[PDB]
Design a binder for this molecule. Structure first.
Ligand SMILES: O=C(Nc1ncc(Br)s1)NS(=O)(=O)c1ccccc1Cl
Ligand SMILES: O=C(Nc1ncc(Br)s1)NS(=O)(=O)c1ccccc1Cl
Ligand SMILES: O=C(Nc1ncc(Br)s1)NS(=O)(=O)c1ccccc1Cl
Ligand SMILES: O=C(Nc1ncc(Br)s1)NS(=O)(=O)c1ccccc1Cl
Lengths: 317, 317, 319, 317
């Protein structure tokens, strides 16, 4: 039987006897994602070039306006806004949403895949809504996922029931369930990181990569893939297995990816899919944030590959 | 003034007072590309998943059928077909087309960018058409380019007049001219290759990549990007500058990519854009093919980076 | 604030503290309508004509609505213009709603690219017996919701509920039904009449006189204009938007009319009344006819209340 | 073999060894039609209603701008412009185009079918272009047709070679040839006119319509259809046969429809499809216009139906 994003969420929502607020949020987010996809694919670009005589800004406005008007949110953190957005009182709901409206968009000049990353928390404090409400550890996530605007547009949604993948059918504007309760391979054959920072790597990453290229056990070397777009790289890791690394370097001593709306949502998808996500020192989902734009190093993917990196990381203290 | 691919090609055709066959060919190719894009973007996939109760094969059929019916071709070479396809006599025209209908589709499960690559030659002799008509050096190309099915769909077309980029507006099915007479940067800051197979690298490749990561002077190390999809990686190399490598080694002394419908059209785009493309021993465009599916090593991109690679390659000779 | 069909229905559902089955029903129907629209607009037709070297639309439309409604877990009995017997949903998929629909009305003239549409009406199953065709034989007064999709120059979904009539425009760039007209009301009196005058030779005498009054008014005021697309959803929607009267009346050759009560007349009558209009058979309210056959026909005269009242005055004159 | 509008026109053009200017105009017009269709189907309406926080005017701007930039036209007459538009010298070509960019749009509030009508003439003298170039009889038409934005979008193109019908495939933005060399039924069973104005009918129209409802030979009465959108009614008459009337009366002795960009293209299509088109006194195509916005009565459709009307018309002298 065919299933769609909206029908899937309503079914899970009724089974859990919730109030519907999360369904309203997710439905509003799904609508913004379809509008972002249409813009990312350049529908209407002919009018920009005069047939009748900014993308990440539009993406942010779509998510902001759809999430505000859902009556389901109270605090919104976006990569595009320096401060948390506090939803006006008459529109307030119980959820906190941290999102990257168009991740990878700096390299959109080359038509690199881009994506939207979102993470959903229940507002925890009973204080007046504030930026502090977004500073919860990833263990607290209620839902998380991403839309990948790749060769096709896919929405990956992770909840307590697990990870489900929905493909956008643009002929009808509906998200179709195509992969149910997805699990990552126990061990992969691809590693993914920007090897241009090889001069700045800590000894543990340098050694782990060496093992991938020159395995001591005479197994075949791993292949390398690195799109430079986190959603594309994490999604390939999810689909094919393997490992994705973005560790700290001299330009980024606390790492480069954002904890709140890049690392946590991806770590949540990984863990619900049976994978792993670590900073080297701890689980990404256990980091307690202090700043809404704070960065984190990240190594994630198949459990055997992350565990192997951790053994090497422990070798070097 | 707004411009479209068809209007552009017609304008050039009338300026050069040609017969129109080339315009008929490119218009047919453009129709196939729009239909490939629609399938790659998964339009109608809801019907596959039972809402009312192949991609590389379809892509090949779309290109094959539109070229045959264009009345502009006589010999069609495809990555998908063991032998050259001879157009039946009543449909015969004067061009030979070598194409990869869906490059990168082996990894299409992860929604990586895929693309269509094509190169157009004039049939040289008046003999009966045969495979031999496709064995021309890339120097003989009359037109070449690619469609990139990325975050947007773009057609990059190289002819004698230079390289022009057309963005597909999917709302109206028109390719809009958005970049005229593009030229690649003299020197880039990105190298692109599969470093997972470093254990098998030729010593020149090992040394060149080592220099990108560990510069001898005080310049910053290059970034690394490797999508694993030739069209995406080459297009990024075109737009941002840098170097793309799929070189020879002792295990594969002739490389992995195919000369007729991957290396030559990309080499041609590069050279019309002020770039370079070498096998290490000679310009890709100067190789005289002996088999329609023969392989070639390819190193292409910004001229300063390719010339520097040739310096290191010559060092180990 | 922008509103969409799914968001509008969820808000009303939450406001009424319902279980969610009707929203799951309407959302499943909304999906079928977007798929019908895409097919009606001939997306992918290049593949039928050999671009790479297949079904009838009304068959496909029926399959889309049937399959989406069955899998909604919200229905138990489905009556379709295309099917002789009601379909009884298998037990594991059963819900509490009965749906009567015409998946692609007007499709006979789709060769000329006339506007076509989807018509639906939703009932609560009344009895506690095991579901059967009987559950669809309720008068239109029992309708829980009704409406139609018009596949015209644009695709619009018109949804009528207790709260009234709302019009949603399909944005095909994103596949969303956008609320564009809230709480629509029909003009008290219009200036257009709509019927097939080619069959005037068979007119009931009351129809003949009423049309004569529209063309040759006794006071010598301006005549009404005439429009008849011949596709019920287009003509009824124009009546809602512009006012006036739409007639598919009875005659001696066809004493019960031609249009179908359960999935054409009742849903349209329900929309008209929620928009403050009228809909009569000549003898009684459409919504009050108690059906005995799921495919029984009904005469229908609907539109602005002053225009319908004037028709009835003439109809009563002719006993 | 599949065919498209652009490929079909290019083939007719090469066969006739023309210069390509007509093909350039028709391709430009085809681009404008797809943009009109896209706006008519309300693509992008969500942005008008605030998702991120006129139509006949746009239609004219689209047609005007694409024709101006086609370099194939010099004089453009539009229902939307009181005077002819003279194309500026550097963009000038040899054709005059009369068009109604979105006919029926006054009733677009109810989503009635609407359409674009066009007729293409060759410029008169080699002198300066002026309004006088649009004052040609329909017999001088080089090509004409209409786009119908109905349940689907179809373009009907009439030339000397006959009438061909192209369906817009919106998944790929291409017009697919679906009905070749169309001929209207010799006699139909439907008449089309606004019977609410019966009080103003000339006696011949009153008599002809009486015969449709109360046939003297006891054959079946005709059905009546009147959308009130000329393109929708005329297209039905072409496909199903029958007759469409917008005749002269005492209140409007020259009719209501416009001769240059409503009546003439439809008459040309009709005559090229083997039908007829009269004002009652003469063939529509033989009226020599004196004002670009002058009106003409029109009766068109199946020949047996038109001839029957003309016989009634002559009975009343
Ligand atoms: O949607 C909820 N209830 C509903 N009632 C009727 C309908 Br139709 S949906 N509840 S919820 O908390 O939003 C939720 C959403 C998704 C998954 C789990 C949960 Cl618990
Ligand atoms: O199309 C050609 N002539 C034309 N005449 C009328 C029209 Br309209 S197009 N000639 S061509 O060989 O196809 C060609 C195409 C592109 C660039 C150069 C060349 Cl030579
Ligand atoms: O959907 C319903 N509740 C919901 N709970 C959570 C969500 Br999210 S929606 N209820 S309902 O019966 O379907 C209904 C729909 C529309 C109008 C009235 C009614 Cl009562
Ligand atoms: O298109 C024309 N020539 C061409 N040569 C090569 C190409 Br590719 S198109 N000529 S034309 O005058 O525009 C014309 C168009 C359609 C039908 C008849 C005529 Cl004569």
């Amino acid at each position: 039987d065919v299933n769609t994003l909206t029908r899937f969420v309503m079914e899970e929502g009724r089974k859990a006897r919730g109030t519907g607020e999360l369904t309203q949020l997710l439905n509003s987010l799904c609508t913004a994602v379809k509008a972002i996809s249409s813009a990312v694919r350049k529908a209407g670009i002919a009018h920009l070039y005069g047939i009748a005589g900014k993308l990440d800004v539009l993406s942010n406005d779509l998510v902001m306006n759809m999430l505000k008007s859902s009556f389901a949110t109270c605090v919104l953190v976006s990569e595009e806004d320096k401060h948390a957005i506090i939803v006006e009182p008459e529109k307030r709901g119980k959820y906190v949403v941290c999102f990257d409206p168009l991740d990878g968009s700096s390299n959109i000049d080359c038509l690199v895949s881009v994506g939207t990353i979102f993470g959903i928390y229940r507002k925890k404090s009973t204080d007046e809504p504030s930026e502090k409400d977004a500073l919860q550890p990833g263990r607290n996530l209620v839902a998380a996922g991403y839309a990948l605007y790749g060769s096709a547009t896919m929405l990956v949604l992770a909840m307590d029931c697990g990870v489900n993948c929905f493909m956008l059918d643009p002929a009808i504007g509906e998200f179709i369930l195509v992969d149910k309760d997805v699990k990552i391979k126990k061990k992969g054959k691809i590693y993914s990181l920007n090897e241009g920072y090889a001069k700045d790597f800590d000894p543990a990453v340098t050694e782990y990569i060496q093992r991938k290229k020159f395995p001591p056990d005479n197994s075949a070397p791993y292949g390398a893939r690195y799109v430079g777009s986190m959603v594309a790289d994490v999604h390939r890791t999810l689909v094919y297995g393997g490992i994705f690394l973005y560790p700290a370097n001299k330009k980024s001593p606390n790492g480069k990816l954002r904890l709140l709306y890049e690392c946590n949502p991806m770590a949540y998808v990984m863990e619900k899919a049976g994978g792993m996500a670590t900073t080297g020192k701890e689980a990404v989902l256990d980091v307690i944030p202090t700043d809404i734009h704070q960065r984190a190093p990240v190594i994630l993917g198949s459990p055997d590959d992350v565990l192997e990196f951790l053994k090497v990381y422990e070798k070097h203290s």
